[PDB]
Amino acid sequence: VRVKSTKINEVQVVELVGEPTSGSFTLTLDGQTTAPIAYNATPATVAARIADLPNIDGNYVKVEGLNEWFHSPYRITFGEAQSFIGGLFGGNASGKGVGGIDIDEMTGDVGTLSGGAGLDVQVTTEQDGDRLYVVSFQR
Amino acid sequence: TFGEAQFIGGLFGGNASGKGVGGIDIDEMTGDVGTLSGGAGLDVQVTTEQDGDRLYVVSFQRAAGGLNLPQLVGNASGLEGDDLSIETATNVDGGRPYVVRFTDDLQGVDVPTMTVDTDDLTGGYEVGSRVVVLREGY
Amino acid sequence: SPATLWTVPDYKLDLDEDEDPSLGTRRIRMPGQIGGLRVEEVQQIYIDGRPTGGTFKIGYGDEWTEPIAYNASPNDVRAALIALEGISANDVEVSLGGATNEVQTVRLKGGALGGTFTLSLGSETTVGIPFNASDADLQGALVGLDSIGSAD
Amino acid sequence: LTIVFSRFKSFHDTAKNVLADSQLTIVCRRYFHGEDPHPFAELSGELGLPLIEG
Structure with missing residues (x-):
């Protein structure tokens, strides 16, 4: 037997709707929740705040600021990691860092934000994650 | 020459980006010929060879994109200068038409071109209507 | 789409003495013939000049709708058209399509060598915009309104 | 996928060669x-409206 797979990453966008002018917000993923993020946090700070989550547990996520309101929206890509057969039985399995997984949508909470009208933290998926495995038999 | 040497939210925090006077319709200088000597009919006259200007273009898109918005009105009161005003114009009025599509028992039928009576509409400006046929039914 | 499929003979009746016998009984499968194609009529109704109240009426041949509100949805236009005796219970679909964006322009006049100004859009009013504002400064002021958003 | 290259060609x-190989x-x-x-x-979509009006 031989196995092949294609990685397709989760991409999610975080929008500070209502245009906040001071304070700090948080993001939730599986209930694990981020140390509060500034209204003008740099994407590399947002990356450290999502990397610290027990369900991510490493520098596996990247984020880019689209710069419509300070750095907002933030566009977050899981698995791009920039701000032997039999090894499974040996406890040295080769798959490292979350990527090609259908990450359930992060939920925002406004925290201490204040500013314009109708504040919320809004989240959307721009590309659903996938890793289809193809198992081909032989010999 | 007035203008050369020799983040969106920054304004609310006093970190406004608009440094250096240039793109402004500056008032014409005057020159005083006191303490100045040695000639005839001495004066310090000035003239302008190109007026300063900046037209800001504002384009409303996405959730503002379908709307026929009201015209921006400017208040000049916080400016300091000799005779201020703010000029605003619509260059493209917005909108989104009703698409009427003839269907089922009118599928493939050459229907009449509609006309819209606007006499009971109120407010607005040059209020009117137009009907554009995208397809003849056939 | 349902289609008629015809198989039609193309027989060779004068075969040479060693030519393929299969050509004597040759028949051609025709492509498949569709019914009459219908084109659905489409008309775009535009209302111009930003009415703030009242009603309009749509004429369909000799008849007219009941009054339609300036604010009407596609479903309100559809209900108004289906009530007109030239149109029956499913014969008209109505929707909105094809945005034109507003584009507006702003200029300061006079030797305004200092201070600040405000813009207003309906009832809402900006923070003060510097006399020498960048494009970013004016966008930030316009985006700080309650109707406008940072994407818009 | 291909490479287009020039130094003042x-x-x-x-x-x-790009058009010929491709x-x-x-x-x-x-x-x-x-x-x-x-x-x-x-034109686009279910109704066949223009992509951009005007």
């Missing part, structure tokens, strides 16, 4: 007012 000399055609048409449709006008 003509566009013809640049495109020649099997592609350059086509050009002059826009004449009052007889042609606008060169970038195209």
